[PDB]
Enzyme design. Structure first.
Site, PDB file in Angstrom:
ATOM      1  N   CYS A   1      10.867  34.862  48.358  1.00 54.09           N
ATOM      2  CA  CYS A   1       9.769  33.948  48.648  1.00 54.09           C
ATOM      3  C   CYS A   1       8.448  34.683  48.822  1.00 54.09           C
ATOM      4  CB  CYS A   1      10.084  33.134  49.901  1.00 54.09           C
ATOM      5  SG  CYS A   1      10.651  34.115  51.303  1.00 54.09           S
TER       6      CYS A   1
ATOM      7  N   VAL B   1       4.857  34.198  46.959  1.00 57.49           N
ATOM      8  CA  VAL B   1       3.673  33.728  47.672  1.00 57.49           C
ATOM      9  C   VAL B   1       2.507  34.684  47.463  1.00 57.49           C
ATOM     10  CG1 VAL B   1       2.719  33.194  49.931  1.00 57.49           C
ATOM     11  CG2 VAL B   1       5.019  32.438  49.351  1.00 57.49           C
TER      12      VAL B   1
HETATM   13  S1  CLF Z   1      13.212  39.044  54.949  1.00 56.82           S
HETATM   14 FE1  CLF Z   1      13.831  37.777  56.720  1.00 56.82          FE
HETATM   15  S2  CLF Z   1      15.693  36.795  55.942  1.00 56.82           S
HETATM   16 FE2  CLF Z   1      14.549  37.423  54.108  1.00 56.82          FE
HETATM   17  S3  CLF Z   1      13.201  35.514  53.189  1.00 56.82           S
HETATM   18 FE3  CLF Z   1      12.096  37.095  54.634  1.00 56.82          FE
HETATM   19  S4  CLF Z   1      12.225  36.158  56.721  1.00 56.82           S
HETATM   20 FE4  CLF Z   1      13.945  35.453  55.417  1.00 56.82          FE
HETATM   21 FE5  CLF Z   1      15.678  33.304  53.407  1.00 56.82          FE
HETATM   22  S5  CLF Z   1      14.192  32.214  52.119  1.00 56.82           S
HETATM   23 FE6  CLF Z   1      15.621  33.187  50.589  1.00 56.82          FE
HETATM   24  S6  CLF Z   1      16.799  34.610  51.926  1.00 56.82           S
HETATM   25 FE7  CLF Z   1      14.791  35.644  51.480  1.00 56.82          FE
HETATM   26  S7  CLF Z   1      14.273  34.700  49.481  1.00 56.82           S
HETATM   27 FE8  CLF Z   1      12.794  33.446  50.740  1.00 56.82          FE
END
Ligand code: CLF
Ligand SMILES: Nc1ncnc2c1ncn2[C@@H]1O[C@H](COP(=O)(O)OP(=O)(O)O)[C@@H](O)[C@H]1O
Ligand code: ICS
Ligand code: SF4
Ligand code: FES
Ligand SMILES: [Fe+3]
Ligand SMILES: [Mg+2]
Lengths: 522, 274, 121, 477
Positions: A152, A156
């Site tokens: 994500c 972004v």
């Molecule tokens: S480092 Fe930590 S666990 Fe990772 S995303 Fe970032 S806050 Fe979350 Fe959840 S949503 Fe899916 S797994 Fe990631 S790609 Fe976007």
């Protein structure tokens, strides 16, 4: 206190009297717990129908989602290639969670890497992170291709993939001839299946876009099979066996069964089998290309139709009797190979099974959930079995899928009391099964809590869960089962009828109360 | 183990006279260190015989960071006795232009390149403006002895005055002292006794008066020092004499900064300016 | 988050409210609020945005990561004592000096001082 | 032994890396010398992971929501952002508790904001406010709400602090906004720090006026025990048998009321120093509450910690401690007598997140095993100074070990047992080496106290001496 002869696990050690007293003291003293009658009243209120009306008025809160983000499917698709590694250009937490998820589900080693950016790349981009990650991965684990997905945060920040990859290959970080396909996998769009589709389309575009001059359709006399997001090795096995029994040249693409299942013999294989690079390069020469899961393979459908010039058949996923027969029809008409007698015998065995178990399968009420094509296949098979699907939920289903499932339900007299939900979560399923009780739910492990809730209301209101789908965490080696094809229908029928009979046996076991129906023969 | 620094206006032969001093110091069994803080990395050209020594900060930025920097990659000994290091400078308008000196000297102490084999360490710092990294060797007391390169031009005197003010400001912080004045000669009249008079009013001594000679340009084409080119050249003996007075210099005084008007009065009384 | 910008170049210290945890750093909140801190690079290596950070509410101190680039630039200017480096490495506590383009805004009240000169006097 | 062999091993392992990765990783592997007090001259910790090396570290969101805030039962935790983050962290950790799910307890349920493309483009403040309102309507019983930010929340620049303040003022409810973006920090340590800071800046300050609580000279607050498989309950019953009164438990089976009542406690017992040292320090500085570290892993460590704990009170507590020790002696004596001969002399390497490698050496050593290699994913230098003494001479120490690395060291050392996480259990299980999940106790436990020590010994004998380990090679091979 622990007896040496009877060592006791946390259950039922914490059921001892002293532990009960300490827990009661703590709760009465420092937890400020609400009165028990109030808790029961709130539980009963949540059971009621007005709570269902309040629940269905939800637009900003999601409780217990039944879907995952795109990079999970991207990693699953990338793992299907030979000597290949998934590389997620993002934070290390994403990769850690994907690896933990797949280790819990498949109970097999899963390989995945990341560049693990921080505030530095958050403010200044991660081109350097791309470079170091690529060169370190190549120098360390020695793959034959690195499939790059995104998280994500990388989406972004507007991080582009092609430019950074080209700069890395230009500055001598990696060899210029190294295949490094990429794809954009935002987590806020779609679900894991869309990520699998994006990764597959990215790989196919990297390998079969700049060499379309000499490709002639049907040159190699072969059919391309795209399985999509699949978590059942038995499905891959039954596809391979059914196509091999039919004498048709087949090319499974992005198939991970060999790496998701390796023999334990004292050494650990990070890489095992997979679809070779030549197979993808030779894919456009095939006569056609069928998609096992059409409703989450739309982008790759557009790619294969507008680039490989393949007339993709309008086939539904091979679950049940009718759609498996249609799939065999299409394969036979494309390849020109007649259906062998073994397939006919297996289908007849299916008909014998359905005849034998119809006396128990009919009239049962089912609430089921999962991925869209899996859900629609299960609904079709239940309709062919005289069952009555009451609550159908797909968290990642669009309006066209809802229209298609409405059409398939209107085609049978057993879909009268059926309602289809999209954009709903498991809390809505809990409310639905509380207000309108089905006989069973069909879903992954996450529904096991819902059953627990029902057991609080009463044994008569408890509804059992049968585990079919993804992910399954509280059962061992159930990922080995088969769902597609006649064998898969066989296994599903066996599981359903056995669960029904187990429920009946459990209900009719009361001594001098309900044991008059505890029949030896059923 | 004494640490010295060349301070002065650019283009007054700071690098060339410094490097010839190094060549003179090398031969009588002395191991010496040379680093130049000049933004142009021409302070180690003649000894190392390289076209342009790769400075510390360039290959620190190419290697990502100064932690990934190796001492051997910058510590090049063109001649056996002497090693050569270049501090370097940023692109114009990019931050302070003296932080390269900061990083170079900090890395130098971090890797301990000052160990058990040093007789003299000599720095070539741009003395046009003393600020940031240029004023740094005065500040952390790294350079015990400072020598000022000057000519008969008035800006050289003004730069020497600014150096004197800087050392006076930081006299109490450490043993930073002015060891003397060295003056290169352009082909202009009434020069040596001028700089002698500036030293006289400064409270400091005049070290040596190095003239303008033809052999220097030939050495420039050669890219080896005059003493390495022409040891019989009178300029080579002049540099040797200069070096032996640097080694045998004993008095290190706190300078006295001189105002604009008295400097101007000396300049008119000598007629260098009208 | 409240920020108090003070400098000899500014006749009056400017108060303004900022959003904590924005991807834009204190450099952005400086630009949108008509406060000029010298900026001379877009890769965070010049160090011309060196500033003094003081957290008036000592109880409300937020942990943060001191990245290697900011660490090395603080070494390049020299505004990083050994004790501050060790504290940032172990207790994850901010140092007194920061870079405006690499410091993230935290939910507290802060006072930022500068002299209008690039990092390194 | 064979220290020279160890450093030659690490040299022969580090060659495959490029110059940058090799140079950086050479700082993170060392040979233990127990005489060293400052580990900073021998091992470097708390650094960013090298890209593309199959690291094991998590994200700050994991360290905050999945570690600190998650075990609290009476509060609802909202994963603000996309769907994967909460889904992969849903009930994946065995922080046990007592209560009713969905009514008064919400530990094993997933609340997420369900971000989509428009949420990223325009913002999520209004969506967060509507979500808070809907939480209030659907769940009246809950005592409070926490909002855990994920990577997009920090990247797009939403003001969750303002909406938290506004909604808390409107609904008279405690709303804790926590900024645990995954890119923040290099590991779960910053997640721990951020969760601690949020706890300090909201819950602790929420009530300072109250004194209606009746205190006692024997008030003790457990800090950093998450009841993994029931560990905190065993520790608590061991404490209460000694005559003390446990007021607060952080955070396994932890309640917001206990969190607020914690500053009224005479003594703080910190179990996990790494995850909760910041709040202990803040408490000691503000309320003047003394805190100290205790270990409840194995009989020896348990007895030492119990005696040191009783040493801080009057003689009645010491007498009760001696009574408890005498009562519980025969149980662990019998456990040792039964299991040590089957367990004597075996060599084990460990790799767990923080303070678990150092905490369980005592339990291993009591049963006759010896630790030959250990390390951490995210421990800082202080944990290394603490753990250098507890390990023997010429043993292996590693930080942020990679999959290739760890595989090579296990191949060369050839231990008999390995304790680590799920992500290595099956890569090591196919090499014919017994493996134990050291994070979740392998769906078993607890391991604290004598009752948990019995479980520990049983499980370790069960895993190590299993027939399946003798049949990895085919008879015709
Ligand atoms: S480092 Fe930590 S666990 Fe990772 S995303 Fe970032 S806050 Fe979350 Fe959840 S949503 Fe899916 S797994 Fe990631 S790609 Fe976007
Ligand atoms: N003794 C000398 N005789 C003749 N020319 C000299 C003498 N010393 C220096 N120069 C000239 O002065 C110029 C300054 O050179 P250099 O020291 O490299 O620059 P800077 O003085 O700025 O460090 C050189 O081009 C050199 O030719
Ligand atoms: S909190 Fe930490 S990874 Fe200290 S994030 Fe992790 S329940 Fe580990 S080594 Mo899982 S710093 Fe606790 C831990 Fe240790 S979840 Fe548990 S076992 S003692
Ligand atoms: S201190 Fe000197 S070198 Fe640094 S920026 Fe100012 S004028 Fe330039
Ligand atoms: S603008 Fe150059 S370091 Fe901040
Ligand atoms: Fe397995
Ligand atoms: Mg020069």
């Amino acid at each position: 206190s622990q007896q040496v002869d009877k060592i006791k696990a946390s259950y039922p050690l914490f059921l001892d009297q002293d532990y009960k007293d300490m827990l009661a003291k703590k709760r009465d003293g420092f937890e400020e717990k609400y009165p028990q009658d109030k808790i029961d009243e709130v539980f009963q209120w949540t059971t009621t129908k007005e709570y269902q009306e309040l629940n269905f008025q939800r637009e900003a809160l999601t409780v217990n989602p039944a879907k995952a983000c795109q990079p999970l499917g991207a990693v699953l698709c990338a793992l299907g290639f030979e000597k290949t590694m998934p590389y997620v250009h993002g934070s290390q937490g994403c990769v850690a969670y994907f690896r933990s998820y797949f280790n819990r589900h498949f109970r097999e080693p899963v390989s995945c890497v990341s560049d693990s950016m921080t505030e530095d790349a958050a403010v200044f981009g991660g081109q350097q992170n791309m470079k170091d990650g690529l060169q370190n991965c190549k120098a360390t684990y020695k793959p034959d291709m690195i499939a790059v997905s995104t998280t994500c945060m990388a989406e972004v920040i507007g991080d582009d993939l092609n430019a950074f990859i080209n700069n890395s290959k230009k500055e001598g970080f990696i060899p210029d001839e190294f295949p490094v396909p990429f794809a954009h996998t935002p987590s806020f769009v779609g679900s894991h299946v869309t990520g699998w589709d994006n990764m597959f389309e990215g790989i196919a575009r990297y390998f079969t876009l700049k060499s379309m001059d000499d490709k002639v359709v049907g040159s190699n006399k072969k059919i391309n099979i795209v399985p999509g997001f699949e978590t059942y090795l038995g499905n891959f096995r039954v596809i391979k066996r059914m196509l091999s029994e039919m004498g048709v040249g087949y090319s499974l693409l992005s198939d991970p069964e060999e790496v998701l299942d390796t023999p334990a013999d004292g050494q650990f294989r990070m890489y095992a089998g997979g679809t070779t690079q030549e197979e993808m390069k030779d894919a456009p020469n095939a006569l056609n290309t069928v998609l096992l899961q059409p409703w989450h393979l739309e982008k790759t459908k557009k790619f294969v139709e507008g680039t490989w010039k393949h007339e993709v058949p309008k086939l539904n996923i091979p679950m049940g009797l009718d759609w498996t027969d249609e799939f065999l029809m299409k394969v036979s008409e494309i390849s020109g190979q007649p259906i062998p007698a073994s397939l006919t015998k297996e289908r007849g065995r299916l008909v014998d099974m359905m005849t034998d178990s119809h006396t128990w399968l009919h009239g049962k009420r089912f609430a089921l959930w999962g991925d869209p094509d899996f859900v629609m296949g299960l609904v079709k098979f239940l309709l062919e079995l005289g069952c009555e699907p009451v609550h159908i939920l797909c968290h990642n289903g669009n309006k066209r899928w809802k229209k298609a499932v409405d059409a398939i339900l209107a085609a049978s007299p057993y879909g009268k009391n059926a309602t289809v939900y999209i954009g709903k979560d498991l809390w809505h399923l809990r409310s639905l099964v509380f207000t309108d009780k089905p006989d069973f739910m069909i879903g992954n492990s996450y529904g096991k809590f819902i059953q627990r809730d029902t057991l609080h209301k009463g044994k008569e209101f408890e509804v059992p869960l049968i585990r079919i789908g993804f992910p399954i965490f509280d059962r061992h080696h159930l990922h080995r089962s088969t769902t597609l094809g006649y064998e898969g229908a066989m296994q599903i029928l066996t599981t359903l009828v056995n669960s029904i009979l187990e429920r009946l046996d459990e209900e009719t076991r009361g001594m001098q109360a309900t044991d008059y129906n505890h029949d030896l023969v059923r | 183990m004494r640490q010295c620094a060349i301070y002065g206006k650019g283009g007054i032969g700071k690098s060339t006279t410094t490097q010839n001093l190094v060549a003179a110091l090398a031969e009588m069994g002395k191991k010496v260190m040379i680093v130049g803080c000049d933004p142009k990395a021409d302070s180690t050209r003649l000894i190392l015989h390289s076209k342009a020594q790769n400075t510390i900060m360039e290959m620190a930025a190419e290697a990502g960071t100064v932690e990934d920097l190796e001492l051997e990659d910058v510590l090049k000994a063109g001649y056996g006795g002497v090693k050569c290091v270049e501090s370097g400078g940023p692109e114009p308008g990019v931050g302070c232009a003296g932080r390269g000196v900061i990083t170079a000297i900090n890395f130098l102490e971090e890797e301990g390149a000052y160990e058990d084999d040093l007789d003299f360490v000599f720095y070539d710092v741009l003395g046009d403006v003393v600020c940031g990294g240029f004023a740094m060797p005065i500040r952390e007391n790294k350079a015990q002895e400072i020598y000022i390169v000057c000519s008969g031009e008035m800006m050289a005197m003004y730069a020497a005055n600014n150096i004197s003010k800087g050392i006076v400001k930081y006299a109490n912080s450490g043993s930073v002292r002015l060891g003397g004045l060295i003056c290169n000669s352009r082909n202009t009249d009434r020069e040596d006794e001028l700089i002698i008079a500036l030293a006289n009013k400064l409270g400091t001594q005049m070290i040596h008066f190095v003239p303008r000679d033809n052999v220097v340009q030939r050495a420039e084409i050669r890219r080896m020092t005059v003493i390495e080119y022409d040891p019989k050249a009178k300029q080579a003996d002049e540099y040797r004499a200069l070096a032996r007075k640097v080694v045998d210099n004993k008095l290190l005084v706190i300078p006295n900064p001189i105002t604009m008007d008295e400097l101007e009065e000396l300049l008119m009384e000598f007629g260098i300016m009208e | 988050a409240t920020i108090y910008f003070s400098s000899p170049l500014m006749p009056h210290n400017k108060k303004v409210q900022a959003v904590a945890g924005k991807r834009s750093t204190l450099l952005g909140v400086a630009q949108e609020n008509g406060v000029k801190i010298p900026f001379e690079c877009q890769d965070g290596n010049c160090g011309s945005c060196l500033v003094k950070i003081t957290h008036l509410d000592g109880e409300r101190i937020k942990g943060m990561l001191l990245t290697d680039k900011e660490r090395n630039v603080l070494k390049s200017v020299g505004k990083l004592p050994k004790s501050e480096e060790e504290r940032a490495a172990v207790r994850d506590l901010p140092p007194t000096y920061r870079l405006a383009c690499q410091t993230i805004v935290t939910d507290e009240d802060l006072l930022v001082e500068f002299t209008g000169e690039p990092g390194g006097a | 032994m064979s220290r020279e062999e160890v450093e030659s091993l690490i040299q022969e392992v580090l060659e495959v890396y490029p110059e940058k990765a090799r140079k950086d990783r050479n700082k993170h592997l060392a040979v233990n010398d127990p005489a060293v007090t400052q580990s900073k001259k021998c091992i470097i910790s708390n650094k960013k992971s090298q890209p593309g090396l199959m690291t094991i570290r998590g994200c700050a969101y994991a360290g905050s929501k999945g570690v600190v805030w998650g075990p609290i039962k009476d509060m609802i935790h909202i994963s603000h952002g996309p769907v994967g983050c909460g889904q992969y962290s849903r009930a994946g950790r065995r922080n046990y508790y007592i209560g009713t799910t969905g009514v008064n307890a919400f530990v094993t349920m997933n609340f997420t904001s369900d971000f989509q493309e428009k949420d990223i483009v325009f913002g999520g403040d209004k969506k967060l406010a509507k979500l808070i309102d809907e939480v209030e309507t659907l769940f009246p019983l809950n005592k409070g709400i926490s909002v855990q930010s994920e990577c997009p929340i920090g990247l797009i620049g939403d003001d969750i602090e303002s909406v938290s303040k506004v909604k808390g003022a409107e609904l008279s409810k405690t709303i804790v906004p926590v900024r645990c973006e995954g890119f923040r920090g290099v590991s779960q340590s910053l997640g721990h720090h951020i969760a601690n800071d949020a706890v300090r800046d909201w819950v602790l300050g929420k009530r300072d006026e109250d004194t209606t609580f009746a205190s006692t000279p024997y008030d003790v607050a457990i800090i950093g025990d998450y009841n993994i498989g029931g560990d905190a309950w065993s520790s608590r019953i061991l404490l209460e048998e000694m005559g003390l009164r446990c007021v607060a438990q952080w955070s396994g089976d932890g309640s917001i009321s206990e969190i607020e009542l914690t500053p009224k406690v005479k003594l703080n017992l910190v179990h996990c120093y790494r995850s909760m040292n910041y709040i202990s320090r803040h408490m000691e500085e503000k309320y003047g509450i003394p805190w100290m570290e205790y270990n409840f892993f194995g009989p020896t460590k348990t007895i030492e910690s119990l005696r040191a704990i009783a040493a801080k009170f009057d003689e009645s507590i010491q007498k009760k401690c001696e009574e408890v020790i005498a009562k519980y002696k025969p149980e662990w004596e019998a456990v040792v007598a039964k299991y040590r001969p089957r367990l004597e002399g075996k060599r084990v390497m460990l790799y767990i997140g923080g303070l678990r490698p150092r905490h369980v050496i005592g339990a291993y050593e009591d049963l006759g095993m010896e630790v030959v290699g250990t390390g951490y994913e995210f421990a800082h230098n202080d944990d290394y100074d603490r753990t250098m003494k507890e390990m023997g001479d010429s043993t292996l120490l590693y930080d942020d070990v990679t999959g290739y690395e760890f595989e090579e060291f296990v191949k060369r050392i050839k231990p008999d047992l390995i304790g680590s996480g799920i992500k290595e259990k099956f890569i090591f299980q196919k090499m014919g080496i017994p493996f134990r999940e050291m994070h979740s106790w392998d769906y078993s436990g607890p391991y604290h106290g004598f009752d948990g020590f019995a479980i520990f010994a049983r499980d370790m004998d069960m895993t190590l001496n299993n027939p399946c380990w003798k049949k990895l090679q085919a008879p015709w091979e």
